[PDB]
Structure formats: C-alpha cells, structure tokens
CSV table of C-alpha atoms and ligand atoms in Angstrom, one decimal:
chain,number,residue,atom,x,y,z
P,1,UNK,CA,-92.1,-66.7,-0.6
P,2,UNK,CA,-92.3,-67.6,3.1
P,3,UNK,CA,-91.4,-71.0,4.5
P,4,UNK,CA,-93.8,-73.0,6.7
P,5,UNK,CA,-96.9,-71.1,5.6
P,6,UNK,CA,-99.7,-72.9,3.7
P,7,UNK,CA,-99.9,-71.6,0.2
P,8,UNK,CA,-103.2,-72.0,-1.7
P,9,UNK,CA,-103.3,-69.9,-4.9
P,10,UNK,CA,-101.1,-69.2,-7.8
P,11,UNK,CA,-100.1,-65.5,-8.1
P,12,UNK,CA,-98.6,-65.1,-11.6
P,13,UNK,CA,-101.2,-64.1,-14.2
P,14,UNK,CA,-102.4,-66.6,-16.9
P,15,UNK,CA,-100.9,-69.4,-15.0
P,16,UNK,CA,-102.1,-72.9,-13.9
P,17,UNK,CA,-100.3,-75.6,-11.9
P,18,UNK,CA,-101.4,-79.2,-12.5
P,19,UNK,CA,-100.0,-81.0,-9.4
P,20,UNK,CA,-99.9,-84.8,-8.7
P,21,UNK,CA,-99.6,-86.6,-5.4
P,22,UNK,CA,-98.5,-90.0,-4.1
P,23,UNK,CA,-96.3,-91.2,-7.0
P,24,UNK,CA,-94.2,-92.3,-8.7
P,25,UNK,CA,-96.0,-95.3,-9.9
P,26,UNK,CA,-96.7,-97.2,-13.1
P,27,UNK,CA,-98.8,-94.5,-14.8
P,28,UNK,CA,-96.5,-91.5,-14.1
P,29,UNK,CA,-94.4,-92.0,-17.2
P,30,UNK,CA,-97.7,-91.8,-19.2
P,31,UNK,CA,-98.7,-88.6,-17.5
P,32,UNK,CA,-95.3,-86.9,-18.1
P,33,UNK,CA,-95.4,-87.8,-21.8
P,34,UNK,CA,-98.9,-86.3,-22.0
P,35,UNK,CA,-97.7,-83.0,-20.5
P,36,UNK,CA,-94.6,-82.8,-22.6
P,37,UNK,CA,-96.5,-83.5,-25.8
P,38,UNK,CA,-98.7,-80.4,-25.0
P,39,UNK,CA,-95.8,-78.2,-24.0
P,40,UNK,CA,-96.7,-78.2,-20.3
P,41,UNK,CA,-95.0,-78.9,-17.0
P,42,UNK,CA,-96.3,-80.7,-14.0
P,43,UNK,CA,-95.5,-80.6,-10.3
P,44,UNK,CA,-95.2,-84.1,-8.7
P,45,UNK,CA,-95.2,-84.5,-4.9
P,46,UNK,CA,-93.7,-87.9,-4.4
P,47,UNK,CA,-93.2,-90.4,-1.5
P,48,UNK,CA,-90.2,-92.5,-0.8
P,49,UNK,CA,-92.3,-95.7,-0.5
P,50,UNK,CA,-96.0,-95.8,-1.2
P,51,UNK,CA,-97.4,-97.2,-4.4
P,52,UNK,CA,-93.9,-97.3,-6.1
P,53,UNK,CA,-90.4,-96.8,-4.8
P,54,UNK,CA,-88.1,-94.0,-5.9
P,55,UNK,CA,-85.3,-96.4,-6.7
P,56,UNK,CA,-87.4,-98.1,-9.4
P,57,UNK,CA,-88.0,-94.9,-11.4
P,58,UNK,CA,-84.5,-93.4,-11.7
P,59,UNK,CA,-84.7,-92.5,-15.4
P,60,UNK,CA,-88.1,-91.0,-15.0
P,61,UNK,CA,-87.0,-89.1,-11.9
P,62,UNK,CA,-84.0,-87.8,-13.8
P,63,UNK,CA,-86.1,-86.5,-16.8
P,64,UNK,CA,-88.6,-84.9,-14.4
P,65,UNK,CA,-85.8,-82.9,-12.9
P,66,UNK,CA,-83.9,-82.2,-16.1
P,67,UNK,CA,-86.9,-81.3,-18.2
P,68,UNK,CA,-88.0,-78.7,-15.6
P,69,UNK,CA,-91.1,-80.3,-14.1
P,70,UNK,CA,-91.1,-79.8,-10.4
P,71,UNK,CA,-90.5,-82.6,-7.9
P,72,UNK,CA,-91.9,-81.8,-4.4
P,73,UNK,CA,-91.8,-83.8,-1.2
P,74,UNK,CA,-94.9,-85.7,0.0
P,75,UNK,CA,-92.9,-87.3,2.9
P,76,UNK,CA,-91.1,-90.7,3.0
P,77,UNK,CA,-94.1,-93.0,3.3
P,78,UNK,CA,-97.3,-90.9,3.7
P,79,UNK,CA,-98.3,-90.7,7.4
P,80,UNK,CA,-100.6,-88.3,9.2
P,81,UNK,CA,-97.9,-85.8,10.2
P,82,UNK,CA,-100.0,-84.4,13.1
P,83,UNK,CA,-99.9,-87.9,14.7
P,84,UNK,CA,-96.1,-87.9,14.7
P,85,UNK,CA,-93.5,-86.3,17.0
P,86,UNK,CA,-91.6,-83.3,15.7
P,87,UNK,CA,-88.4,-85.5,15.4
P,88,UNK,CA,-90.2,-88.1,13.3
P,89,UNK,CA,-91.8,-85.5,11.2
P,90,UNK,CA,-88.4,-84.1,10.4
P,91,UNK,CA,-87.2,-87.6,9.6
P,92,UNK,CA,-90.2,-88.2,7.3
P,93,UNK,CA,-88.7,-85.2,5.4
P,94,UNK,CA,-85.0,-85.9,5.5
P,95,UNK,CA,-85.5,-89.5,4.7
P,96,UNK,CA,-87.1,-88.4,1.5
P,97,UNK,CA,-84.4,-85.9,0.8
P,98,UNK,CA,-81.6,-88.5,1.3
P,99,UNK,CA,-83.1,-90.9,-1.1
P,100,UNK,CA,-83.7,-88.4,-3.9
P,101,UNK,CA,-80.2,-86.9,-3.6
P,102,UNK,CA,-78.7,-90.4,-3.9
P,103,UNK,CA,-80.6,-91.3,-7.1
P,104,UNK,CA,-80.8,-88.1,-9.1
P,105,UNK,CA,-78.7,-85.7,-7.1
P,106,UNK,CA,-81.2,-83.2,-5.9
P,107,UNK,CA,-83.7,-82.8,-3.1
P,108,UNK,CA,-86.7,-80.5,-3.0
P,109,UNK,CA,-87.6,-77.4,-1.1
P,110,UNK,CA,-91.3,-77.7,-1.8
P,111,UNK,CA,-93.7,-80.1,0.1
P,112,UNK,CA,-97.3,-81.0,0.4
P,113,UNK,CA,-98.5,-82.6,3.7
P,114,UNK,CA,-100.2,-85.9,3.2
P,115,UNK,CA,-104.0,-85.7,3.6
P,116,UNK,CA,-103.5,-81.9,4.0
P,117,UNK,CA,-103.0,-82.8,7.7
P,118,UNK,CA,-100.8,-80.3,9.6
P,119,UNK,CA,-100.9,-77.9,12.6
P,120,UNK,CA,-98.7,-75.3,14.1
P,121,UNK,CA,-96.2,-78.0,15.2
P,122,UNK,CA,-95.9,-79.5,11.7
P,123,UNK,CA,-95.4,-76.0,10.1
P,124,UNK,CA,-92.5,-75.0,12.4
P,125,UNK,CA,-90.7,-78.2,11.5
P,126,UNK,CA,-91.2,-77.2,7.8
P,127,UNK,CA,-90.0,-73.6,8.5
P,128,UNK,CA,-86.9,-74.9,10.3
P,129,UNK,CA,-86.2,-77.1,7.3
P,130,UNK,CA,-86.8,-74.2,4.8
P,131,UNK,CA,-89.7,-75.7,3.0
P,132,UNK,CA,-92.5,-74.0,1.0
P,133,UNK,CA,-95.8,-75.7,2.0
P,134,UNK,CA,-98.2,-76.1,-0.9
P,135,UNK,CA,-101.8,-76.8,-0.3
P,136,UNK,CA,-104.3,-76.6,-3.2
P,137,UNK,CA,-107.4,-74.7,-4.2
P,138,UNK,CA,-108.9,-77.0,-6.9
P,139,UNK,CA,-109.6,-80.5,-5.6
P,140,UNK,CA,-110.6,-82.7,-8.5
P,141,UNK,CA,-111.7,-85.5,-6.0
P,142,UNK,CA,-110.1,-87.9,-8.5
P,143,UNK,CA,-109.6,-90.6,-5.8
P,144,UNK,CA,-113.4,-91.2,-5.9
P,145,UNK,CA,-113.0,-92.6,-9.4
P,146,UNK,CA,-115.9,-90.5,-10.7
P,147,UNK,CA,-114.4,-89.2,-13.9
P,148,UNK,CA,-117.4,-87.2,-15.2
P,149,UNK,CA,-117.7,-85.6,-11.8
P,150,UNK,CA,-113.9,-84.9,-11.6
P,151,UNK,CA,-113.7,-83.4,-15.1
P,152,UNK,CA,-116.7,-81.1,-14.3
P,153,UNK,CA,-115.2,-80.0,-11.0
P,154,UNK,CA,-112.1,-79.0,-12.9
P,155,UNK,CA,-114.0,-77.0,-15.5
P,156,UNK,CA,-116.1,-75.2,-12.9
P,157,UNK,CA,-113.2,-74.3,-10.7
P,158,UNK,CA,-110.4,-73.6,-13.1
P,159,UNK,CA,-111.1,-69.9,-13.6
P,160,UNK,CA,-110.4,-69.0,-10.0
P,161,UNK,CA,-108.3,-71.9,-8.7
P,162,UNK,CA,-105.0,-72.7,-10.2
P,163,UNK,CA,-103.3,-75.2,-7.9
P,164,UNK,CA,-105.0,-78.4,-9.1
P,165,UNK,CA,-104.8,-81.5,-7.0
P,166,UNK,CA,-104.8,-84.9,-8.6
P,167,UNK,CA,-103.2,-88.3,-7.9
P,168,UNK,CA,-101.2,-89.8,-10.8
P,169,UNK,CA,-101.1,-93.2,-9.1
P,170,UNK,CA,-104.7,-93.9,-10.3
P,171,UNK,CA,-105.0,-95.2,-13.9
P,172,UNK,CA,-108.2,-93.3,-14.4
P,173,UNK,CA,-106.6,-90.0,-13.4
P,174,UNK,CA,-103.9,-90.4,-16.1
P,175,UNK,CA,-106.0,-92.0,-18.9
P,176,UNK,CA,-109.2,-89.9,-18.5
P,177,UNK,CA,-109.0,-87.0,-16.2
P,178,UNK,CA,-105.6,-85.7,-17.4
P,179,UNK,CA,-106.4,-85.5,-21.1
P,180,UNK,CA,-109.6,-83.6,-20.2
P,181,UNK,CA,-107.6,-81.2,-18.0
P,182,UNK,CA,-104.9,-80.6,-20.7
P,183,UNK,CA,-107.6,-80.0,-23.3
P,184,UNK,CA,-109.4,-77.5,-21.2
P,185,UNK,CA,-106.2,-75.7,-20.4
P,186,UNK,CA,-105.5,-75.4,-24.1
P,187,UNK,CA,-108.9,-74.0,-24.7
P,188,UNK,CA,-108.5,-71.4,-22.0
P,189,UNK,CA,-105.0,-70.4,-23.3
P,190,UNK,CA,-103.5,-70.8,-19.9
P,191,UNK,CA,-99.8,-71.5,-19.2
P,192,UNK,CA,-99.5,-74.9,-17.5
P,193,UNK,CA,-96.4,-74.4,-15.4
P,194,UNK,CA,-94.9,-75.7,-12.2
P,195,UNK,CA,-96.1,-74.6,-8.8
P,196,UNK,CA,-92.9,-72.6,-8.2
P,197,UNK,CA,-93.2,-70.8,-11.6
P,198,UNK,CA,-96.9,-70.1,-10.9
P,199,UNK,CA,-95.8,-68.5,-7.6
P,200,UNK,CA,-93.0,-66.4,-9.2
P,201,UNK,CA,-90.1,-68.6,-8.0
P,202,UNK,CA,-87.8,-70.0,-10.8
P,203,UNK,CA,-86.0,-73.3,-11.1
P,204,UNK,CA,-83.0,-72.2,-9.0
P,205,UNK,CA,-85.1,-72.3,-5.8
P,206,UNK,CA,-86.9,-75.6,-6.2
P,207,UNK,CA,-84.0,-77.8,-5.1
P,208,UNK,CA,-81.0,-78.0,-2.8
P,209,UNK,CA,-77.9,-80.0,-3.6
P,210,UNK,CA,-75.5,-79.6,-0.7
P,211,UNK,CA,-76.5,-82.1,2.1
P,212,UNK,CA,-77.7,-80.6,5.4
V,1,ZN,ZN1,-101.4,-87.9,-0.6
C-alpha cells in the first residue's frame, strides 16, 4: 500500500469494512459490543477532542486495540485540513498520535481526512508522516438522521462498495443503522473486517509504537 494516496475500495475478496468517524463518544461501547457479538471487526477513525475525549474512554480504547478492531486517525479536533498550513496539519496529526500513545500505548498509521477535505498539500504531509489515507465508497448519509434512507443506501451499494462510512457518535446510527448493516452483512455471507485487513495489510502495520 502507498502512503499519501486516497484509497477508496477494498481489494480482498468477500470482504467488507464497516468504518466509523468522529468518536469516541457515549454510543461507541454499544457499537463495539454489537460487532463482537456478531464476530465482526470495525474501523474507528477517532478525534482527540470532538464529541468525547480520548482520555475518558481508556478501557474502551484498550479493548478496541487489543481485540483487533482498527483505530485510525481523524485528526486532533476535526478541522478542514485544506484551511490549515502544512505545519498545523502535521500538528493535527502528531497531537492525536501523542495522546493515543500515552493512554493505550499505540498510535495509528491510517487516517481519514475530516469532511473528506484534502488537496495535494494535505497528501504530502500524510506521505511524509507515513499514513495510509482512507476515503470511502459507500456513504450511508447517516448524519441526515434518515434511517430508512440510510439502510436502503447501504443495501443498494454494498455489493460493489465495501468501505462503509458511518458516524458512531449519533445514537440513531448505533441503535438502528448498525443492526441493519450487521444483519445484511450476515445475509450476504461477507467477512466484516478492518480496513487494513480488507486491503491486505495485517495488524502489524496498523500502528507504530516508537515515538517519532
Ligand atoms: Zn468526520
């Protein structure tokens, strides 16, 4: 896998990656329990401070890492990265790294730009930092709070699009959309794995430990 190149699709056959942005927050524990009860893994792109704060979810963050879900970076506090200087972009990343390594010991090598906002200057910062940049190809539009519409968009797009974007900070996403997504995955007999696994990259490459 290349660094600093937007990645849109899974490549490993039979695979699906349910991914979740903007957490952790008060519903994430619920979401993780749902995935584990069904034998599935999730990929969670977290912020340092947004809805919740990393330091308030240490046990959850530890189990996410130890149980082989995938933690990715969603920057420290969710700005439009194209509206920042290259130095502040880098600090949006390393600030997140430094807080995760202090609480659970690891920091990620995968990220998703907030609002999918990035240009050639954002990507070179990501390439210098060694990050895989994960977009998506199935947008559930779950932030509109239209659950019938979201569940239907998932069902219509799941055959060809396997990097599924949701936001686990919204109660409706966790209590309504996610059960519908898990059930449809079970019907289609797909393997709900992490984004790295769905790209052919195993656990040893999702994190770094030694500080920069
Ligand atoms: Zn976001």
